Amino acid sequence: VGITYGYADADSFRPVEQAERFFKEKLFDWTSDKPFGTLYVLELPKMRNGWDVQVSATSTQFNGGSLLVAMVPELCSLKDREEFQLSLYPHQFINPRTNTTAHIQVPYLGVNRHDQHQAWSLVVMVLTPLTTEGTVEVYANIAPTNV
Amino acid sequence: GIIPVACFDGYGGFQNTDPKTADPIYGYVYNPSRNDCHGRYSNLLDVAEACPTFLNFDGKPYVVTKNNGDKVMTCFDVAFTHKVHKNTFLAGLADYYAQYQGSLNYHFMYTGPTHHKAKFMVAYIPPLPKTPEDAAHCYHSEWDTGLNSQFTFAVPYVSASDFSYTHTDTPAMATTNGWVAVFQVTDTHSAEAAVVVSVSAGPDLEFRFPVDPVR
Amino acid sequence: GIIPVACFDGYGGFQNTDPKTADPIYGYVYNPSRNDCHGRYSNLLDVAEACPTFLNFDGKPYVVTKNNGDKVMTCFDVAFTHKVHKNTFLAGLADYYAQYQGSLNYHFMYTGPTHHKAKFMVAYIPPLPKTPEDAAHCYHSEWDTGLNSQFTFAVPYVSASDFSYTHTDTPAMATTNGWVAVFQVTDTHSAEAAVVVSVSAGPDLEFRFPVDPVR
Amino acid sequence: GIIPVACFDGYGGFQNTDPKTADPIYGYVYNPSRNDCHGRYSNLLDVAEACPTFLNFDGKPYVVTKNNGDKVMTCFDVAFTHKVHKNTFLAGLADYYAQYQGSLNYHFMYTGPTHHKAKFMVAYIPPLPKTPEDAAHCYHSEWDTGLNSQFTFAVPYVSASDFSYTHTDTPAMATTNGWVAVFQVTDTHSAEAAVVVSVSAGPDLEFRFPVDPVR
Amino acid sequence: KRVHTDVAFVMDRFTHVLTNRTAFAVDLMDTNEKTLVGALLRAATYYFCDLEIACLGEHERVWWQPNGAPRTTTLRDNPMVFSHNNVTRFAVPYTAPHRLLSTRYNGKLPSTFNFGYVTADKPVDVYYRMKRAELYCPRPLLPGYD
Amino acid sequence: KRVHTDVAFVMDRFTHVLTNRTAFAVDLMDTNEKTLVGALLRAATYYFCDLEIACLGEHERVWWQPNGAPRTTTLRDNPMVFSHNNVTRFAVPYTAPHRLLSTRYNGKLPSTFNFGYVTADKPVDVYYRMKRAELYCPRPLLPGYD
Amino acid sequence: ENNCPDGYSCGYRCRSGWGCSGDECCGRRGGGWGSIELIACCSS
């Protein structure tokens, strides 16, 4: 639980940016009928800017499951066995019993210093099917930083 | 005024891994800089240590608790060629290296309801009985899902040789690499839960002899 | 007493750009001096910066004020392949170089009677609206022909890539290089004037990768 | 800018004993260590000095005391090609070397009953009479099996040349290498006994010019 | 200390990329996706290197044009290397206009992601070597063979 | 700092000037007027360099007389270089009596503006390289191609 | 003793948007490659 800064600079954290705009959107209905690997990919944007996404879910003490929320840079496609290595990307876990809310911030990334071109894609995967003992909804809050 | 030399036989052929450099065409090029770029990695295994990747338990990364009395949720080898490790980044990285040595870290995450608390023990069985009492004399560790739903189980390197072979053929051999297994000590199971298992390279793991597999 | 060597394969062929020198025939020649000579230039881009060259507006380097209401005397790309830049020393240099990066300086000289005073503006529209209000958010400058009949406008480098290609084919593409445009803010035009436009390399301009064009 | 050289004729052929090294393939390998290993020997003759090996007296390493009056038990040469030395480590090591020089140490061990004490003298007869009186003017020594049942008899190098030939053919030549013989001074023989004889390289022995016997 | 997993060590190898070609772009994605170099290159989003091109086969000379140069049938006074013992090895600088090259692109890769163009007198077999290779943003890597 | 547009760097290249000639003057205006070396040379009113000549082709040896030497069919003991691997590269020092050479002349260029005279055993292809070139009085330069 | 949750260590400079006077945050490497996670400030 906390705030994840993907591809962070080691020197910059030795002992600035901020979110300018805001947005909200529902992604999918988290239900037990979706097994592992139920990907939901959202390209960003839906100016040399870094993104800041706060994916949240509505879960109670009787809800169980796990979502993997990551930001893949230039996700053209995902192969059959590639999902298992998604943790290679700036990612977080949403668990109803641990944090039930994700927050990832990534810098500008590209071949050039100015972008047009979906550089980043927010990917949400259902790592484990939803378990209960009454529906769970996922809402994504996306805000550009340092435009 | 002429240096006498002798062109030896045997040297001079085109080697694809020779240390010698070539003669540049545009020798006065100066690319600006790449210092402030993000995500640079200069070592492959450094990526594998900090990026645990999930295991393949019959197409799924999690393990379902069983109501029947067996006390063994899973029993998988520690071989990179095993179907369990098939999807991991380490196995993908191990396919291109002949030999390896070092330790593995296995990460376990519990994704059940917050009300249900379960206690699990992880046992390593060096090259085999499948009971906690016989695993007491062997390497073992126990973690309760009431303090941290995240457990790391370092697997020591106990192979006979200094280095092991990345490529081999052992489906369920008793002496494969140590038979990591997960035991649930609580027989008072309430309902179905899940345990996500992922593996990351240990701080001392080391691959060697890069190989192009043409199998 | 013989140094063992090994003649490698791959090196030794005749390269037209090799750094190695040859063996002179008359090795004891001494040409007197060229220190007190005039006009020596050791860099082509220094000449390009110090010597602005005129543009080609349909066979003429000057633009004529129009009586009709359009407020746009000229609107030309910043591409070296554009016919407007066809007759410049910068375009001549660009034909032999693969890539370039940097800024340009456009020099405008008023060529009318001394009694007639006019105020012009020049705008650079990065990769497009053609109005002064929308150019206010863009990079625009304004000069009045009552103080100096000689104005310099610095067109910066705002291309996406670090370097840009000197060879391309874009007639009036909206993203060619920035669409330098000239407006007359005063609608009280009196008679037929003329404005001479020339271009020169900026202090930071730099070409790279010389190329023989065999198109 | 080119160094003038000249590829001499005669050098450059593939020598099987050339000091030059080759170009490694995996030049960044680092085997851990072999410091704490046991039994390493860096010199072959150091092994031969510290490891005496038995002689071949008609298939047996020992000598049977004779009841008849001859005062001689064995009379064997000091040649590595002789059938007596055939089974020794020195002869096996001498088969691969052209020449040698130095001394030999012959170890005699008495393996009889403790009650029976016998006195033996060992004589070296340089290149021949077989009597102790004639051996008095020659090199000889005497040891009694009542103090130490282990005797060392150093054989000095008295060959005419500085180095001798390991490979030769002399069955019982009077000038082979010195005709080491063992004499028993006590004619009061009681019963049958044995004397184990072994040879080890002297501290000054030195083989040279390794060769491959293709006889 | 681990040496054989270093990127600058692994990528510093001549990999066979294409066989029997006379004129070709030097797109580093021409490498085989199952070889060591190709697989570890495709496991990174971005990269940068100075290349070495080796041409093996019966050919007299090889011309190389930097990235951005116009494509023409006949090359005159362009960078040309004559073959020695039917081998032509030469080091190509990073001529792309971009700061870094990318294996993937969420737009097929545009033509600007290459190290130039190469023409040969006769068809040759080509080997690529990444000198001082730098990799960025690691991507999933999977076992090529089972 | 700009390097690739330096005069001492650009002109330091072998340019193909003529093909299949056995005896030829070493005038520097034989260069193709559209090549990089040829066009930039004609963009200067005066120049100075120590030429390098390369001959490619089946020839046993090549000669070279300095500027001003009489022209004769048979050459004896004149500066002669034998070909190695059918290539003859040799550095010709600056030879003209004038302090500087010129591309244009308001007075066709007179015969004194050359670096010598070269006769080959058999016809060869010739490449010129300008070592330590020094250009003077820049002249208009135009795009060769559109 | 350091006042950070389990697995969190100090010595990480706080990035913009945390309001920590000492500029020391309970940093934690994880979440990908090169990712750095901050959860709160560091108090000594």
Short mmCIF file of C-alpha atoms in Angstrom, two decimals, chain F residues 21-135:
data_model
loop_
_atom_site.label_atom_id
_atom_site.label_comp_id
_atom_site.label_asym_id
_atom_site.label_seq_id
_atom_site.Cartn_x
_atom_site.Cartn_y
_atom_site.Cartn_z
CA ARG F 21 42.52 5.78 -67.99
CA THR F 22 46.17 4.80 -68.34
CA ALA F 23 47.74 8.28 -68.56
CA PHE F 24 46.08 11.34 -67.05
CA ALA F 25 46.84 14.67 -65.47
CA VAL F 26 46.18 15.03 -61.76
CA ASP F 27 44.08 18.17 -62.10
CA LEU F 28 41.67 18.41 -59.18
CA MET F 29 38.85 19.68 -61.43
CA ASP F 30 38.32 16.21 -62.90
CA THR F 31 36.13 15.46 -59.87
CA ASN F 32 32.42 15.05 -60.52
CA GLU F 33 30.69 18.39 -59.96
CA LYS F 34 27.77 16.76 -58.11
CA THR F 35 29.73 14.71 -55.56
CA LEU F 36 30.36 15.95 -52.03
CA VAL F 37 34.07 16.57 -52.64
CA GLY F 38 33.60 17.88 -56.17
CA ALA F 39 30.79 20.32 -55.41
CA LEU F 40 32.28 21.81 -52.25
CA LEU F 41 35.62 22.23 -54.02
CA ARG F 42 33.89 24.33 -56.70
CA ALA F 43 32.26 26.36 -53.91
CA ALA F 44 35.72 27.81 -53.15
CA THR F 45 37.68 30.21 -55.33
CA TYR F 46 41.07 28.96 -54.11
CA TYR F 47 42.27 25.82 -52.36
CA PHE F 48 45.37 23.92 -51.24
CA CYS F 49 45.87 20.26 -50.35
CA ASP F 50 48.33 17.37 -50.37
CA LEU F 51 46.64 14.93 -52.73
CA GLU F 52 46.44 11.17 -52.26
CA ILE F 53 45.93 8.99 -55.33
CA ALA F 54 44.50 5.47 -55.33
CA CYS F 55 44.45 3.25 -58.42
CA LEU F 56 42.18 0.20 -58.55
CA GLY F 57 42.51 -2.37 -61.30
CA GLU F 58 44.83 -4.86 -62.94
CA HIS F 59 48.08 -2.88 -63.19
CA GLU F 60 51.64 -3.88 -62.37
CA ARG F 61 52.92 -0.41 -61.45
CA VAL F 62 52.20 3.30 -61.79
CA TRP F 63 54.41 6.36 -62.29
CA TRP F 64 54.10 9.99 -61.25
CA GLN F 65 55.95 13.05 -62.48
CA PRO F 66 55.86 16.32 -60.52
CA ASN F 67 54.24 19.39 -62.01
CA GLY F 68 56.44 21.03 -64.63
CA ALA F 69 58.28 17.87 -65.67
CA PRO F 70 58.27 17.20 -69.43
CA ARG F 71 55.73 14.75 -70.83
CA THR F 72 57.32 11.61 -72.28
CA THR F 73 56.00 8.23 -73.37
CA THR F 74 58.73 6.13 -71.71
CA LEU F 75 59.56 6.75 -68.05
CA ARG F 76 62.88 5.73 -66.48
CA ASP F 77 63.52 5.95 -62.72
CA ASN F 78 60.66 8.43 -62.30
CA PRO F 79 58.68 8.03 -59.04
CA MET F 80 57.19 4.56 -59.42
CA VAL F 81 54.96 2.48 -57.15
CA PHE F 82 54.10 -1.20 -57.61
CA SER F 83 50.57 -2.40 -56.96
CA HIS F 84 49.78 -4.62 -53.97
CA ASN F 85 46.53 -6.60 -54.25
CA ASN F 86 45.64 -4.53 -57.34
CA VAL F 87 45.62 -1.30 -55.31
CA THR F 88 48.21 1.50 -55.55
CA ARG F 89 47.81 4.21 -52.91
CA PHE F 90 50.46 6.91 -52.73
CA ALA F 91 50.58 10.43 -51.30
CA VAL F 92 51.37 13.18 -53.82
CA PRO F 93 52.81 16.37 -52.29
CA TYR F 94 51.60 19.77 -53.44
CA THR F 95 53.63 20.57 -56.53
CA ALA F 96 52.30 23.58 -58.45
CA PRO F 97 54.57 26.66 -58.53
CA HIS F 98 51.71 28.91 -57.43
CA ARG F 99 51.07 29.53 -53.74
CA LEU F 100 47.41 28.53 -54.13
CA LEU F 101 45.37 26.76 -56.79
CA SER F 102 42.09 28.09 -58.15
CA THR F 103 38.90 26.51 -59.45
CA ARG F 104 37.86 29.48 -61.59
CA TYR F 105 40.06 31.87 -63.56
CA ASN F 106 38.99 35.02 -65.41
CA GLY F 107 41.68 34.99 -68.08
CA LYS F 108 39.66 27.73 -68.95
CA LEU F 109 42.19 26.91 -66.24
CA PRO F 110 45.83 26.90 -67.42
CA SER F 111 47.83 23.70 -67.37
CA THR F 112 49.84 24.82 -64.33
CA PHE F 113 46.93 23.99 -61.97
CA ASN F 114 47.54 20.30 -61.38
CA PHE F 115 49.29 18.02 -58.90
CA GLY F 116 51.41 16.28 -61.53
CA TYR F 117 51.02 13.60 -64.18
CA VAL F 118 50.31 9.90 -63.69
CA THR F 119 50.86 7.07 -66.17
CA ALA F 120 49.74 3.53 -65.37
CA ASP F 121 50.82 0.23 -66.89
CA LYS F 122 47.19 -0.65 -67.64
CA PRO F 123 44.00 1.43 -67.35
CA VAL F 124 42.81 1.89 -63.77
CA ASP F 125 40.08 3.59 -61.74
CA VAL F 126 41.42 6.61 -59.87
CA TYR F 127 40.36 8.08 -56.52
CA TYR F 128 41.48 11.46 -55.17
CA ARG F 129 41.77 12.37 -51.48
CA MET F 130 42.42 15.91 -50.26
CA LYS F 131 44.67 15.82 -47.19
CA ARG F 132 44.67 18.97 -45.03
CA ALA F 133 42.44 20.85 -47.46
CA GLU F 134 42.29 24.64 -47.12
CA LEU F 135 39.48 26.40 -48.99
#
